[PDB]
Amino acid sequence: IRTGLTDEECQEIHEMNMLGMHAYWSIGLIANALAYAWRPFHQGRAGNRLEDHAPDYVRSAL
Amino acid sequence: IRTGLTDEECQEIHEMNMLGMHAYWSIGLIANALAYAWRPFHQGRAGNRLEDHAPDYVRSAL
Amino acid sequence: IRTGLTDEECQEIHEMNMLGMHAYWSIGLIANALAYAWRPFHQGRAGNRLEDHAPDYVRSAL
Amino acid sequence: AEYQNVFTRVQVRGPAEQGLEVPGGSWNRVGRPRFSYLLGKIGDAQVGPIYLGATGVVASLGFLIFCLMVGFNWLAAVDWSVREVFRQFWWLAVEVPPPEYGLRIPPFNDGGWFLWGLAICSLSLLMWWARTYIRARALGLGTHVAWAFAAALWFYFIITIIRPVAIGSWDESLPIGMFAHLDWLVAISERYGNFYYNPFHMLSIAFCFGSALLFAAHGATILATGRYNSEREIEQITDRGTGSERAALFWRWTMGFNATMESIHRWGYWMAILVPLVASIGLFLSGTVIESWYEWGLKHNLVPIYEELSDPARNPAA
Amino acid sequence: AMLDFERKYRVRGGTLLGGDLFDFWVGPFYVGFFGVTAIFCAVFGFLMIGLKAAISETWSIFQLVLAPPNLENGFALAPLDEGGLWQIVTACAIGAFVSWALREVEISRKLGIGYHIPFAFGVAISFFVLAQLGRPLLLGGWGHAFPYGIIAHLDWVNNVGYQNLHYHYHWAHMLGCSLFFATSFALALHGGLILSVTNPKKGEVVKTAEHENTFFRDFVGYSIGSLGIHRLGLALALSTSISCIFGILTTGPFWSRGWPEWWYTWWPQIPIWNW
Amino acid sequence: MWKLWKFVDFRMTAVGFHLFFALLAFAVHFACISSERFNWLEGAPAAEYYMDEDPGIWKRTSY
Amino acid sequence: MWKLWKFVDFRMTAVGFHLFFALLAFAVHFACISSERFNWLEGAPAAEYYMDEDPGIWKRTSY
Amino acid sequence: MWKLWKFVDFRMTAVGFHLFFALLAFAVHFACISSERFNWLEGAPAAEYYMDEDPGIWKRTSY
Amino acid sequence: MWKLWKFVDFRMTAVGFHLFFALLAFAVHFACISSERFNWLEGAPAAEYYMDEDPGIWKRTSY
Amino acid sequence: GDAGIVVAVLVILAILGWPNISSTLRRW
Amino acid sequence: CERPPFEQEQTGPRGTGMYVLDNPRILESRLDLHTAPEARPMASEDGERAGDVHENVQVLADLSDEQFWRIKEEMTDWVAGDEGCTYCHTDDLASDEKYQYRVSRDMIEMTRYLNANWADTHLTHSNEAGVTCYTCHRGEPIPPASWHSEEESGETRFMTGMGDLQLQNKISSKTAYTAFPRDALDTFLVGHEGELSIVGEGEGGLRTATTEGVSLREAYEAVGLMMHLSYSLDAGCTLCHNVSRWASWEDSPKERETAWHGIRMARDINVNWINPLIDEYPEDADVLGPTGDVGKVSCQTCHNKERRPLYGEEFLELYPELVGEPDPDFDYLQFGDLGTDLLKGV
Ligand code: A1LZM
Ligand code: A1LZM
Ligand code: A1LZM
Ligand code: A1LZM
Ligand code: A1LZM
Ligand SMILES: C/C=C1/c2cc3[nH]c4c(c3C)C(=O)[C@H](C(=O)OC)c4c3nc(cc4[nH]c(cc(n2)[C@@H]1C)c(C(C)=O)c4C)[C@@H](C)[C@@H]3CCC(=O)OC/C=C(/C)CCC[C@H](C)CC/C=C(\C)CCCC(C)C
Ligand code: HEC
Ligand code: HEC
Ligand SMILES: [Fe+3]
């Protein structure tokens, strides 16, 4: 059903919404880029399990 | 039952609906293509279980 | 009892309903064809249990 | 005897009331209102219409998905025999991950299905809570029902997620099974001392026994004062009548103190929603702060000490 | 010390037993002869609880218990140091609960209201009586009844439940736990509904019975109504007390094996799925 | 069936069909997951990888 | 189907699709985590790391 | 039986039949999965694979 | 999508996104915690510390 | 490596999707 | 449905609820199952040794001929069932062609070991009972309450599939028909790493920084084993506990202590006597369990829903030939508690 908002009110809400969604989107994208450069989220074919690459004395939660 | 929405209101709703549906659909297709290129979702007749292809020392959760 | 919809409203509902059901039907048929070519859903008389065909060092969880 | 206000001997039917106008109500209210005469014996005969809201529909769908995940797991557990599912209906469960994963989401059949269903069920319960809130708000009501559900859901999230996370193991979470979640009760209480010695267990049982007490007493009070239209409690709150006066005076002459028509509902609301809240507190402290409620209550002079047994059992492991 | 409207109802009569001698009020409390006897039984029972605290040197509400006699004692009067104090307090508690319910009958008569409240209290009293008499009669002695300790009767509940291995699986326990949970659930729903109707957001008017009916119709498809919610609540709490009666009277007397084994005995063998 | 919406509510039909097909898509994906042959997440080999011939479906093969 | 909003409440449809897609995103992500091959959180190796030939998906490979 | 809708609600009948048939399709597909012969998810062999003659259905075969 | 607030309540949409994103931030942070590779609180090593070359994500590496 | 491409793409998407830049494509 | 009266045994302080109710009618109905056969008259120790008048006699070599024949007839009455002498014997009575012959040789050794070493701590708690062949077998080749590993611990696990109960959530007498872990018998009565002391202790009842307990799953497994114990002895938890304080041995009835030894004894029986029999069995024997395992001994194997096997009938003096010499290095703490010295092979 209709919300009763005018065109001006809808446009104001949309400007604020675009600001919020896109600021959060860019900050989250930069955050995920930083975390991905820290440790890439997705393993290669070799994987990134410690048991498969680290020595035996390196404990892994498996 | 009738929602009471006019043809123009239904058309602007449908414009937004097509935008959201098809934008999400294309983003998801790109995301699934990326995840598929990372690791194809569907195994071959040989499968993609580590036990069938990796050496014995490669631990498999399966 | 009667939903109160006129012939035109029922006809346009049925246009959309035909579109939705048949688009889903065709997409599902294509998806099932792809999955069937990947792995036929129905076994032959020999079956498709790994234990009956695999060289028995292949782990079958069945 | 006098009419006991237990059953409505003579039911009257008006036109099926679709409901008071709410935003989206004309479309989202679904189902031709059906009148159950059996339900009319106790309360309102009308069944439906139900609001087909987004939160309600998707919460019900997620509940169905969760139930079907549980049923498919039970089937695959009994070799897809519905006969064996029903034979072992109470025993069968979607088991939680074992401790060796800790907080890891394991493979489906090593407790991963449990975590999957936990996500689905938790999201569905949150959507149902949102439906509770929004259905109250659409009618210009307080969200007290939503917050009672929030207390119950807070306890549920403590049982299933928050406290397993704080302990650091998913095996502390509640298995999805009839007998399995009772076995979880036993395992939690005995692993962590004894919940009979858990004072938040004591208080939650006090509030559950007192929910029964208050709600027996309040239903009895309302049925006793229904001679004076006390069951129409909203009117008795805004326009205090002799039924509310008589209820208050009964309880004042009995206990020395009474409630009002509104404050008895405050009492019952808080007594009920305190069960899951202090329940969550006690369960969370079990395994995070408290290792044994028996030893803890021994330190606090809470646990009774009984007569020393003649010839006690001596631990052979010293 | 008296409600704004209280004096308007404070009339003589309505006594079951007591006439006008005990028909008065002390402060807020109506007394009646059953109030006199309830105070007698309550204070004497608490003095016997204190006597057990003295003889057991247990001056802790949590550690103090009046336990029933030993099982070998049977139905015999026990020494006060060997369960006799529990027997005295059992008589005192039965008398105090019955006197309290009868005083509530008197108050209900005086107010012209139905006797539903003393009836529901009498359902709870019936649980207590059948637990402290029916279980001894079934099992052959006062020692099978639960003791009088704040924490120690919890230990008795623990041990009697674990006598049947896994007490959760008891059918009466399953039904009664469902009924207690449904009672707290329905009390939460009902208090929340009434408060939601009478306490909407600030600036909103008080809603009506139509509002609460359409709230639960929109919410769960069914609204039980003003009368229905109180009838269902009395029914839920009463039925949970009857379930408690059945549970305490069946665990041991009517099943000495595990309740898991009780469930295994019939449910898996139901012929519609036992093949 | 265009007249069905004169007697059958398209609201409930469409909503219930979407809800049921979500539930059924989950059910069918569960059935595939529970199958060793069809669980793509497990990634087990197909028996056809080891058969020397086409099993068929109606092929009426013999041992 | 721009006329669907003459008969289906778009607010319900959009909000319910968002809710169900939150639920389905959790379901699918949890399904991937529950898979060894697709658990990026655990980071197991792919069998393609140890295969000398491309397994394919529809490729009619044989042992 | 076109007059059945003079006395029997067609919406109730159609909704109930669709609901029961959803449950019945689930139940019957479950019955097939329970059957070793008919469980395509497990894919067991047919006994006809090892038979040297047609078993029949009504055929008066003797051991 | 500025027309959406003609039909979808913005206040509830923004409140719901903020609540769901608090929920999801907790869930995703937990998902990192559950992974030893990504649990910064436990601080486990990365397997890349012991790899001779870059594992890649799509690198098509071979053992 | 591939992580470099992923990080660069995420940074580019954040730059393009920043409100000051993403709002330049606002059409009303 | 059950019914009063009951044989009651108050196992703890009054009013604590610590008592056991046993149905007299049920014990009467199980009287055939719970009573050993009438013993044969005592056989003289004077005479030629059985290892001298018989070719292939090794375990019973030190027995007199009359004692040998007495114990052979009793073993036939206790394990052979309706097969008689042919159950373990071919046409040649000195040939171990049948696995039952060699398994019964090891079983005589095990019964001698149990009567010599487990009598002081478990097998003579109330009466100088000990165990015979009939204590477990009850006249049958397979002890009715012998247990095998569940057909889920040995199956290949579909890790990413559906329907894995994790050895729980299924009907089993091994857990007294609870949904508790069904492999608890393997965990505790075969394995030694299992922890039965699952109740938290902490310090002051608190999860102190040094406090390490068991997981909730370990609590599940231990409570499942305890369900098995209660099922086997036809008593509740109160038989051996004030359930309010499971960790408190001082508050537990004496039957807990002997139960403790029974646990270890079962482990002993399973680790040193039952499992090493798998070599003697045929590879595809129908007697073997679904996991290809020999039936192990649990609490129920001797306690066939009875507090004391065979109504505590005394067999130590009655069958001296089933009582061996005490093991010089026997120690009930060397079965997975103070060490694993006496669990051979592990
Ligand atoms: C191990 C073990 C175990 C157990 C045990 C057991 C046994 C033996 C039994 C039981 C019971 C049960 N429970 Mg239980 N438990 C468990 C647990 C549980 C749970 C969970 C969660 O888990 C849950 C929820 C549950 C609950 C229940 C419910 C239902 C019930 C309770 C309630 C009653 O009863 O009270 C009832 C009670 C009543 C009624 C009471 C009445 C007063 C009176 C008049 C009044 C007056 C008084 C006075 C004092 C005055 C005051 C003054 C002022 C203050 C001034 N659970 C575990 C398992 N269990 C019972 C029965 O059965 O029922 C059915 C019995 O018997
Ligand atoms: C280790 C760790 C980690 C993390 C972590 C964290 C925390 C802690 C948090 C987070 C977040 C968040 N994220 Mg992340 N991550 C991660 C990953 C990820 C991923 C993947 C794939 O992997 C994704 C997609 C994400 C995403 C996100 C979002 C959704 C949010 C935000 C929002 C925004 O705006 O951003 C922004 C946004 C964004 C980033 C998105 C974008 C799209 C793109 C272009 C495309 C896609 C693709 C795809 C999907 C496929 C590929 C894969 C393959 C296999 C190759 N994350 C890791 C694993 N986190 C947050 C939240 O949730 O809040 C609520 C938080 O708190
Ligand atoms: C490992 C990992 C993984 C993944 C991952 C993830 C995450 C994390 C997520 C997701 C998603 C999603 N997806 Mg995916 N995936 C996967 C796979 C898949 C599949 C298969 C086939 O397999 C499908 C079909 C899907 C699909 C989807 C959608 C539906 C959603 C949305 C998005 C979109 O829109 O896109 C878009 C769309 C799309 C992509 C789709 C379309 C049609 C197509 C062309 C065709 C079809 C075909 C068929 C079915 C048959 C074949 C197979 C055989 C066997 C050969 N996914 C893997 C397994 N995810 C999301 C959600 O849920 O939301 C809510 C999320 O979060
Ligand atoms: C804008 C606008 C729009 C729309 C619209 C519309 C209209 C108008 C319509 C529609 C439809 C629709 N859809 Mg839709 N949509 C959208 C979307 C969507 C999506 C996304 C996410 O994107 C999705 C996924 C969707 C889906 C759908 C579906 C459900 C449907 C189709 C169905 C069919 O076709 O079938 C077809 C199909 C067929 C016939 C086949 C049958 C089978 C059955 C049962 C099965 C059974 C079985 C069983 C039970 C057993 C199983 C087995 C295992 C072993 C277990 N959407 C947008 C929003 N739409 C239709 C209907 O409903 O109907 C009634 C119509 O009309
Ligand atoms: C392995 C794996 C797999 C699968 C997979 C999946 C997933 C994941 C999913 C699915 C689906 C679906 N499907 Mg399928 N599949 C499978 C098979 C099948 C079958 C058989 C036969 O087998 C059927 C019949 C089906 C069907 C279907 C639908 C109903 C839907 C879609 C829709 C449409 O429309 O399409 C479309 C449709 C379609 C495709 C179909 C229709 C009729 C047709 C022409 C004809 C019929 C025939 C018959 C029954 C006879 C048999 C024979 C043999 C030799 C015995 N699916 C496999 C087993 N999925 C979806 C759903 O559910 O949604 C809700 C999803 O998600
Ligand atoms: C299905 C319905 C139910 C129901 C219904 C209902 N209960 C009512 C009424 C209605 C309608 C009343 O109308 C009445 C009232 O006035 O207050 C609202 C009342 C009441 N119940 C009370 C306690 C209550 N009730 C509980 C359960 C239900 N109550 C079920 C759920 C529970 C538990 C454990 O669940 C508790 C502790 C008091 C507050 C009050 C009685 C005062 C009294 O007896 O006076 C008498 C005054 C006194 C001081 C009594 C002292 C007597 C002896 C000598 C003192 C020693 C006590 C014992 C031996 C008991 C065992 C101790 C345990 C540790 C082992
Ligand atoms: C399995 C439980 C047995 C049953 C039943 C019977 N016998 Fe046996 N017998 C069995 C064993 C393992 C042994 C070897 C004893 C040893 O100390 O090593 C025997 C021994 C004999 C012998 C002596 C063998 C020889 O050297 O000749 C005889 C003669 C004999 N048994 C006879 C016998 C009879 C007559 C039985 C039925 C009444 C009988 N046995 C039962 C194992 C088992
Ligand atoms: C309990 C501790 C036992 C005592 C005492 C004796 N036996 Fe036993 N025996 C026991 C078990 C648990 C099993 C395994 C049963 C199974 O499920 O496989 C056995 C097995 C045997 C067998 C072989 C049974 C068969 O496969 O046919 C024999 C022949 C046997 N036992 C003989 C035997 C004799 C002669 C004993 C007394 C000297 C004896 N057993 C004691 C458990 C126990
Ligand atoms: Fe009320």
- Alpha-carbon D59 to chain mean position: 17
The rounded distance, in Å, linking the Cα atoms of A12 and A57 is 60
Question: How far C46 CA lies from chain F's nearest CA (Å)?
Answer: 6
Q: J18–A23: do the CB atoms touch at under 8 Å?
A: yes
The rounded distance, in Å, linking the Cα atoms of G53 and G60 is 13
Q: Specify the amino acid at residue A49.
A: R
The rounded distance, in Å, linking the Cα atoms of D118 and D112 is 10
Residue B19 is encoded by which pair of tokens?
């935008």
Residue among F7, F62, F63 minimizing CB distance to H11: F7
I-D interface (Cβ pairs under 8 Å ≥ 3): yes
Sequence-ordered alpha helix ranges (H) in chain H: 10-34
The rounded distance, in Å, linking the Cα atoms of K284 and K279 is 12
| Maximal CA-CA distance, chain J | 41
**Nearest by Cα to K12 from E64, E67, E74:** E67
The rounded distance, in Å, linking the Cα atoms of D313 and D318 is 11
Which atom of ligand 3 lies closest to the CA of B39?
1
The rounded distance, in Å, linking the Cα atoms of E17 and E23 is 9
**Nearest by Cα to I37 from G47, B62, G40, G45:** G40
Q: What is the resolution of this structure in A?
A: 2.4
The rounded distance, in Å, linking the Cα atoms of G11 and I7 is 6
In SS3 terms, chain C reads as CCCCCCHHHHHHHHHHHHHHHHHHHHHHHHHHHHHHHHCCCCCCCCCCCHHHCCCCCCCCCC
Q: A5–I56: do the CB atoms touch at under 8 Å?
A: no
Number of neighbours of residue F25 by Cβ within 10 angstroms: 13
Method: cryo-EM
Q: Specify the amino acid at residue E94.
A: I
Q: Which residues of D179-202 are buried (b: 16+ CB within 10 A; e: fewer)?
A: bbebbbbbbbbbbbbbbbbbbbbb
Bridge partners, residue D94, by sequence: D176
Please indicate whether residue F24, judged by its CB atom, sits closer than 6 Å to ligand 4.
Answer: yes
Kindly write down the DSSP assignment for every residue of E128-178, as one continuous string: HHIIIIIHHHHHTSGGGS--EETTHHHHHHHHHHHHTS-GGG-HHHHHHHH
Q: C42–H40: do the CB atoms touch at under 8 Å?
A: yes
A25 membership: H or E segment, kind and range? helix A7-38
Q: Is residue D11 classed as helix, strand or coil in its secondary structure?
A: coil
Ligand nearest to the CA of E170: 1
Residue among D22, D48, D148 minimizing CB distance to E188: D148
The answer to whether the peptide bond before residue E200 is cis (omega within 30 degrees of 0) is no
- The backbone region for A47, taken as left when phi is positive above 0, alpha when psi lies in -120 to 50, beta otherwise, is left
Question: How far D52 CA lies from chain F's nearest CA (Å)?
Answer: 9
- Alpha-carbon D116 to chain mean position: 22
Q: Is residue H43 classed as helix, strand or coil in its secondary structure?
A: coil
Question: How far F28 CA lies from chain H's nearest CA (Å)?
Answer: 10
K8 neighbors K235 (Cβ within 8 angstroms): no
DSSP annotation of K160 reads T
* Sign of the torsion angle spanned by Cα atoms G56, G59, G60, G62: negative
The rounded distance, in Å, linking the Cα atoms of K187 and D276 is 35
Q: What are phi and psi of K46, to 5 degrees?
A: -90, 130
Q: Which of A48, A52, A56, A62 to mutate to test the interface with I (most CBs of I within 10 A)?
A: A48
D264 neighbors D236 (Cβ within 8 angstroms): no
Kindly write down the DSSP assignment for every residue of E192-212, as one continuous string: HHHHHHHS-STTPPP--HHHH
C-alpha to C-alpha distances, E157 to E131, E146, E164, K192, K305, nearest whole angstrom:
12, 8, 11, 33, 25
The rounded distance, in Å, linking the Cα atoms of J10 and A27 is 10
Bridge partners, residue D93, by sequence: D177
The rounded distance, in Å, linking the Cα atoms of E66 and K14 is 10
**Nearest by Cα to K256 from D271, E227, I3, D311:** D311
J28 neighbors J22 (Cβ within 8 angstroms): no
Kindly write down the DSSP assignment for every residue of E209-271, as one continuous string: HHHHHHHHHHHHSB--HHHHHHHHHHHHHHHHHHHHHHHHHHBTTTB-S-HHHHHHHHSTT-T
Chain D: partners with 3+ C-beta pairs within 8 Å: A, B, E, F, G, H, I, K
Kindly write down the DSSP assignment for every residue of E93-115, as one continuous string: HHHHHHHHHHHHHHHHHHHT--S
Using the Cβ of A51 and the Cβ atoms of chain G, whether some distance falls under 8 Å is answered with no
G39: burial class by Cβ within 10 Å (0-12, 13-18, 19+)?
A: buried
Residue K63 is encoded by which pair of tokens?
């027995």
Residues K259, K264, K265, K269: what is their CA dihedral angle, to the nearest 10 degrees? 140
The rounded distance, in Å, linking the Cα atoms of E105 and E108 is 5
Q: Is residue K205 classed as helix, strand or coil in its secondary structure?
A: coil
Q: G34–D113: do the CB atoms touch at under 8 Å?
A: yes
F12 neighbors D30 (Cβ within 8 angstroms): yes
Residue among D90, D194, D252 minimizing CB distance to E28: D252
Q: Which residues of E146-174 are buried (b: 16+ CB within 10 A; e: fewer)?
A: bbbbebbbbbbbbbbbbbbbbbbbbbbbb
Residue G20 is encoded by which pair of tokens?
């169900």
Question: How far A53 CA lies from chain J's nearest CA (Å)?
Answer: 18
The rounded distance, in Å, linking the Cα atoms of A60 and G44 is 13
Q: C55–G57: do the CB atoms touch at under 8 Å?
A: no
Q: Specify the amino acid at residue B52.
A: D
The alpha carbon of F39 and the centre of ligand 5 are apart by a number of angstroms equal to 16
C-alpha to C-alpha distances, K143 to D251, K146, K298, nearest whole angstrom:
66, 5, 11
Sequence-ordered alpha helix ranges (H) in chain B: 7-38, 50-53
Which residues line ion ligand 9, judged by CB < 5 Å?
D 233
- Residue identified by tokens 């058969």 is F51
The rounded distance, in Å, linking the Cα atoms of E118 and E98 is 9
Using the Cβ of C56 and the Cβ atoms of chain F, whether some distance falls under 8 Å is answered with no
**Nearest by Cα to E167 from K173, D182, K222:** D182
